[PDB]
Ligand binder design. Sequence first.
Ligand SMILES: *[C@@H]1O[C@H](CO)[C@@H](O)[C@H](O)[C@H]1NC(C)=O
Ligand SMILES: *[C@@H]1O[C@H](CO)[C@@H](O)[C@H](O)[C@H]1NC(C)=O
Ligand SMILES: *[C@@H]1O[C@H](CO)[C@@H](O)[C@H](O)[C@H]1NC(C)=O
Ligand SMILES: *[C@@H]1O[C@H](CO)[C@@H](O)[C@H](O)[C@H]1NC(C)=O
Lengths: 497, 497, 497, 497
Amino acid sequence: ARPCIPKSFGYSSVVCVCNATYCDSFDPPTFPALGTFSRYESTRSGRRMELSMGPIQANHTGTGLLLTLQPEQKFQKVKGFGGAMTDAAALNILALSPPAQNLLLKSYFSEEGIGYNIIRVPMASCDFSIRTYTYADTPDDFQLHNFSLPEEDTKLKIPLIHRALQLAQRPVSLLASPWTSPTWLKTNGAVNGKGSLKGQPGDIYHQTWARYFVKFLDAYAEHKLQFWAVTAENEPSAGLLSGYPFQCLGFTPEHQRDFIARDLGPTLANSTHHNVRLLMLDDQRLLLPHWAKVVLTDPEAAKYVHGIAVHWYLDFLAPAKATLGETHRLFPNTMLFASEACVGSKFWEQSVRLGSWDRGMQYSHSIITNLLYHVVGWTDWNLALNPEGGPNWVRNFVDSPIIVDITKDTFYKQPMFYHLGHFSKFIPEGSQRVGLVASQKNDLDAVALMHPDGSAVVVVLNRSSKDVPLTIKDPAVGFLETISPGYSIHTYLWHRQ
Amino acid sequence: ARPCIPKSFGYSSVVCVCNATYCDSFDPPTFPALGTFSRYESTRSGRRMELSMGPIQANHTGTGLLLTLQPEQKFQKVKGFGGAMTDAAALNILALSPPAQNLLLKSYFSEEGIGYNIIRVPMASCDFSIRTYTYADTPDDFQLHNFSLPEEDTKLKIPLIHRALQLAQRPVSLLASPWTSPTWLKTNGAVNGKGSLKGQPGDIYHQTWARYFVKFLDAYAEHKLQFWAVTAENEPSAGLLSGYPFQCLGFTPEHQRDFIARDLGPTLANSTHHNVRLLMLDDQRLLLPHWAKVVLTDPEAAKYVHGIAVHWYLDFLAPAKATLGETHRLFPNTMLFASEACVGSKFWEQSVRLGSWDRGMQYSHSIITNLLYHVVGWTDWNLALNPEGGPNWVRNFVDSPIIVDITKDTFYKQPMFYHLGHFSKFIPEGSQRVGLVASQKNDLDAVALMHPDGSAVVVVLNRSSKDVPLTIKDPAVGFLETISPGYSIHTYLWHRQ
Amino acid sequence: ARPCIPKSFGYSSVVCVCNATYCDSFDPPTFPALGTFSRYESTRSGRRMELSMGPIQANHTGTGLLLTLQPEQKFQKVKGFGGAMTDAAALNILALSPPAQNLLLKSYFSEEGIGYNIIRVPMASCDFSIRTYTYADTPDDFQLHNFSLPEEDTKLKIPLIHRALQLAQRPVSLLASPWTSPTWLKTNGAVNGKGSLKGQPGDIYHQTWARYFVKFLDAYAEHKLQFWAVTAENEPSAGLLSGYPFQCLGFTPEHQRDFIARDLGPTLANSTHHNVRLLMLDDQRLLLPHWAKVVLTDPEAAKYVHGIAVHWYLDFLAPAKATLGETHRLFPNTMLFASEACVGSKFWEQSVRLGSWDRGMQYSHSIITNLLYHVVGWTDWNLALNPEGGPNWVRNFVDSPIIVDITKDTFYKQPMFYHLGHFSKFIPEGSQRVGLVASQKNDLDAVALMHPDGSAVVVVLNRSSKDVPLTIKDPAVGFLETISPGYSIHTYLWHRQ
Amino acid sequence: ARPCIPKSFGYSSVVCVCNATYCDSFDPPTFPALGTFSRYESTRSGRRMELSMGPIQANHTGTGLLLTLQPEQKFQKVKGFGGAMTDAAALNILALSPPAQNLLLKSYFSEEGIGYNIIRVPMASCDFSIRTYTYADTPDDFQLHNFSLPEEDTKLKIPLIHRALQLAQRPVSLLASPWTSPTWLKTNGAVNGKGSLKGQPGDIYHQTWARYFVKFLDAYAEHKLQFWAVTAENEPSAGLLSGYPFQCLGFTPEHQRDFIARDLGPTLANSTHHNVRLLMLDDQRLLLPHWAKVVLTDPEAAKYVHGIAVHWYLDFLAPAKATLGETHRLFPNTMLFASEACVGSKFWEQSVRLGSWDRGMQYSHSIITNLLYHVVGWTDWNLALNPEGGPNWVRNFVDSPIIVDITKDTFYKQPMFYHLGHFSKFIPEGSQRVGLVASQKNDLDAVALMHPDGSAVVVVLNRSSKDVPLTIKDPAVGFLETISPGYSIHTYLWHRQ
Ligand SMILES: *[C@@H]1O[C@H](CO)[C@@H](O)[C@H](O)[C@H]1NC(C)=O
Ligand SMILES: *[C@@H]1O[C@H](CO)[C@@H](O)[C@H](O)[C@H]1NC(C)=O
Ligand SMILES: *[C@@H]1O[C@H](CO)[C@@H](O)[C@H](O)[C@H]1NC(C)=O
Ligand SMILES: *[C@@H]1O[C@H](CO)[C@@H](O)[C@H](O)[C@H]1NC(C)=O
């Protein structure tokens, strides 16, 4: 419906510029007529999820690369894609004028945008907040009588989640994660630094912390929001480190295991929120498979754990078979779910590199690796940041796919936004990853899935500077003859019957 | 009645620790017979507004510096002393338990505290707000039917003010200042950045803005609050600087003049709040004499201006004589008032330094200089901040006399608080600055005033490391022999008959 | 002449991109024919010192703004224009490939560039150094036996200065300033923080320090480099402030006075380098006229002082007449010289803002202001910086007219470069400022000078958005009919016979 | 012989203060009769390589953890331990007065110190250099006639290396790594950033690069220095990261393979320095086993490779078993060597922390892990750094075992330094690692080795806060009853015959 307005800031590619009256969008989604394929294309030269259609042909000859769909090699089913409603993201989007906010929420949540169906909601404050608070800052308040949501929740976060869900046709899943407990529950009595819960699992500190999860859920339910899942703690391993600079709460894998079996599991079960799922870990994938073994080989903790949540800082490089693979082999029936990714910890590069196609490729390459290793969903960090990559109370800034320029009442959709959307738009909940065999080694990243309805979706990333001719075989329909240009990403869609 | 409990944070002096059940306080004011003085003393070494008495004797044993009171040499009368009830300050005070809230408010407003009689109230949001916002965010409501107070006003600020004035013996004067207008009244359509009101004084926008002041004053009146005065805009020169980060609204001196002439003055006059004073500038003193010349050398703007509000922030750029001194000479009948009497801090320093005696010595030095250059009143910035100098939705650069640690239900009284109190507690409204002649060049800062009742008040600041032997002469009573210790501030008080 | 290659980075204007093979340049300078004027134009829209020529008319009618030259009202003679060869500057330039370096040095020092004839040299380390050092770091070395220049001088700074002088057709004048003494000459024993020279003027500390100036001079002399002037100390006021974060040495005006009278004056006088001039102050003009009074009303110190060096941080708009004016009036025979200026506090935006036209206008506006107040010279801070605005060992980054991108082997010439060039290219040493009378009130900044050969030069800056038609009147020749477009800068040059 | 002089800087432990006349040292090694052990102990509490002796008894009086020496399971033989003589380290050493220089050099290199036997020597500049430079910076010297060593080599590094080897008992092995080639060999003509060599293995550029290694070695031989080994490139994977800030030269594993195969190997073989060993990777352990699989499964490449060099950056991203363990299995005859066995510093901590015991433990823990995974040698990063972690021409990022204060002619020996000496002092070249079996799960890190003379060394690290009672059995001699105190590291030494 509306094309990208490109703007350069001197990096490898362009941003798309949005304001109160204009934002790039899509027409309502239609399926390609049987015997044809749809293609979406984003490129470094500046194409943005641009649509074409082509023929599915009956024959193929040649010694070029062929990707062959294996429709009966069925893997993980998809939960979905989204990002986080942090204090910072909330503050930024509401600093835009009301029509700009709506254009921004449409970009992510609407069918005319990229169909996000996950929103991660911090339980009180994190580094991406402009102050440090909890829901229970009255010292020693074991009954949680002074539990309340600050304006950050009731003025900024909640209203925006309501608006986001309104704009979405897909059911949206809310995920919650706490960074810290009240300081009076903690051995070190602070929001940061080294420290865990006081006492032993089973006891008043552990029981009050469990109950705070339930109060959180109650108070969001008062505002007509329900959660799909909660995590046991954001980055439990961070509060094990002396001088950790922002909000944290340390657990060893053993302490997490015991908290869940002794406190958190039974407490959620006994509540009216018992259908909310629980996810362990919520941390670096390098901590796998050990964390999962400690927790899940204890049937008392296992009964209560729906899934394993993993983080990744994309500026680094951890292998995936060692961690996601082994974890899946050890516990095939416990879902693997990526709850946070970000880039921009890059030290020679600033926090926000406006228009960076490299950071775009980092994202889609990470999504593909995750889908290739059983991961069922993928969640970005902050939904929106400023040109500095904040606000952040500890100046630990990072990139975000949307950047808000408040003085200009404009936002910028970076290549990260489009590289995310090549998945989120075309891979609905229930999509099932299926096999796809390459006929010769190549430099391309590829993944195939089938929608609930039975149709095919393939994403292909080209992180090289050379164009790659390739054909995709679907034995039900024929061949799609295409080229993957260097520095492009494609989504291919077709009906199979 | 209760002494300071000292705590060191590794800076040059101490804070006084207060909590829900304890805070340092004063006995009611009780002053002695003719021929005796009262001294209140604060030292870097740890004394905090400590009281003693001594004689005023017929003969002179001092051979060093002599300050002679000259009651017949009469200057300006004093409006008073206070600070700002910003969203930040209100949120911080209200994060304490009720009894703690009361000790903090008594610390400022009661006679058992330091006797504040002025409160500055922002009109909607500033940087010291957790969110951007105005009282009229619905676009094109030129009649402001949609005008209202959010929760920041009706929940935080308004009851805290009601409680401030219950606690106070002296009448409290309220002062309002806007930071930004609704953004649909603005050129740049943004809450911050370079931009002014749309079009020309007299037009549809300039008139709606003027009516906004009336709507603000009305809304506070429904809540039983009356204002002493308003500023025409907070820091109007700021919103002429491209992408200024905070809520701003740009006026040139000429634009301010015409808005007052054509719109603000005429509208306020035609209202039921015609008694509310109008203050121009509200900005760095470096902009004087010029700003005053532009606005006040126009009879139709000048007839509407009671005063000139000034900020201390950038005092070091332009000196007192050339700015305040010169302005008074040209416009001797328009009062000078320090409306945002606040600090720096320093590029290489933290916003909040707990126990910084320097930051205190800066406060008193600056109040003295002001007093010596015709200034009638002083309004500090935020009443309280958190230990990070927040919350500020942009970035915190400033300290505050009271720092709240919400996690501990404790608040800290900085040296700045006592430095302020050496003036505010003992210079009531209507006190007149009188002469005080040094006999020889010296390093003290000193100022003398006479209370409405005729009794003498003298402040001696020793910003140096060395004890200074001092005599104070009153022609009518005799000689007060004393010592001004290095890094001390003293207030002397005595009956004159 | 090779024209500018424009690039945007999202700011108000473009930069000019240079590399190993291409840099925008000028043709050799030509006098315009008698009866015609030369114009050089730079605009926000993207013109960079474009040459045009027009006619000098015999008469004029209007109404319009008329700037009238007063050839016989003669003011200050110009010393010149240039910038600082810091460690940061030099490390950056030498990180370019040999051919790129030369294009950068040509830009500044060549007649085919912008004609710089000042280079300010730090005497050892400053904040724009990647380590701290002095030339005499052996403790208690009073004889200065281990005085030596490091590679920072011998490998980076010196060879670049040689190459700059080689490229220049004009005589270049070198100006040296120290930030710190050896730590064993200081009271606090550190390169930074609050502290002065130990002992009293006249003693071994003060003598050794004076002899260090001579040793510096000797060492630069062995490398065939001769100095025009030395400052008594960079920002003497800075060493008076506890916690001052980088290299400093504190002098009160009195200590500076006496150091000069007792030590630095006689020592330089007794040396072979007695022809090198001594400039006092080297700090902000807010310190004036007081510093000058204190130093210069002492004939023992006055006899040794050739000039007053002044700094301005351009983000702090503060006047002007009260400092530079009052100073010239008191000491008409002691030149004022601007020895350092920089932009980039704007805490709302970066150190570096690639393509900022605003920062360009701050430079030229400050040069006009200076020139209209008797100032004979203007020196920029760092010649070149990286995109972060360093390196700087204390992260005190600022903007620079040339920015080096080392990974690209490219340098960007910001609008600050050209805004400076409108002066340095066209006002040689010896030029005399003359009168220029505006016929009516106007928003333009303007300044007229006469070249040593009798020809005129006028710079006109338009900082408003509106085009201003205007005529320049010279009695010798007639009228120049022209327009000043909004956000533009022009230099006009004509022969007067 | 001389004890540690301790100084605290507010971190968890102390540094040992050394100056021109005083440094801690050891007595000449002296080992007791069969049945007696020697123990060196360092504690966070303050003990530094403190010596005591004790018996090896017939009866077992302990009932806790038992460690049994298994001299018959024999593993890798040890090459040695050392650090890098960077420009920065040479800087930093040479700013000290000669006597102080020598005490620093004995600290590392003599038997009265910690007996270093490896130095890593960068080939031209790296980040720890005060300028960028290579040895052939004049373009189109394809035959390298203008190849020369600058002053950093001939003035700083080489004389220091000479002096190190005079001081050393043991033969010292020199290891050379290039960071960057001449820029006119690089795709990008920049010293840093994304860029590899130009063209293809075999061509003019690759042949010149390879001859550069021979000219480098040639030049060092005229200075009477010869090398043990070179690495093919320092950190090749970083030259693939866009805008990489440090000196670099990108190689994919396939490219390194081909450059070793076609150029580097053949060229070194044909030369007079054919006995110089060649190590591959020189990069993070996460890159393994893959990197190794690419280069070593090609007999044209592998006939030319002696070892695999790894960095400890970046170790947290990958575990030992999966990388080092798995690489040993696949290629059991290619030795693993830690070439840059250094930090790195947590995003929120300073580069240098004086007295950080935790950083010390990080070192010894990591040397232990390495030894338990077949690693034969170590090179720490910079030998010395200034208290800022410099000079680094890009960014001060890491700590160094010795920190040098040039202002005070004093140097500080950090905990890291004694943790290193617990190994380097007592593990001579040719020591072979042996079995050391734990009787039960425990928390100590322990490794046993056999000297070339068949005597025993065991290092025990206790990273916990609690004392652990410990017995060590040697089947041949008996039982050593001991305690590993919390936060301690022990070295045990005994004859077995
Ligand atoms: C925003 O939208 C489009 C951008 O292409 C443009 O035509 C319009 O001028 C812009 N509007 C504002 C309010 O800046
Ligand atoms: C409040 O302060 C008083 C005076 O220091 C003290 O006795 C009391 O313990 C404090 N309250 C708490 C809960 O610490
Ligand atoms: C340098 O810039 C010129 C002019 O824009 C361009 O044509 C040339 O290719 C550039 N060279 C390099 C090495 O980037
Ligand atoms: C060197 O150190 C020793 C022992 O700490 C000390 O006695 C001596 O004063 C030191 N030398 C100097 C110049 O301080």
